[PDB]
Amino acid sequence: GFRSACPPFC
């Protein structure tokens, strides 16, 4: 899945 669940990706 591709989602902005930081850390470390947003």
mmCIF file of C-alpha atoms in Angstrom:
data_model
loop_
_atom_site.group_PDB
_atom_site.id
_atom_site.type_symbol
_atom_site.label_atom_id
_atom_site.label_comp_id
_atom_site.label_asym_id
_atom_site.label_seq_id
_atom_site.Cartn_x
_atom_site.Cartn_y
_atom_site.Cartn_z
ATOM 1 C CA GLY A 1 0.000 0.000 0.000
ATOM 2 C CA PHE A 2 1.033 3.580 -0.630
ATOM 3 C CA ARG A 3 0.072 6.006 2.069
ATOM 4 C CA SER A 4 1.678 8.914 3.855
ATOM 5 C CA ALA A 5 2.188 7.381 7.232
ATOM 6 C CA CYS A 6 5.153 9.185 8.627
ATOM 7 C CA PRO A 7 7.532 8.644 10.061
ATOM 8 C CA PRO A 8 9.239 8.485 7.739
ATOM 9 C CA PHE A 9 7.026 9.213 4.664
ATOM 10 C CA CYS A 10 4.766 12.272 4.292
#
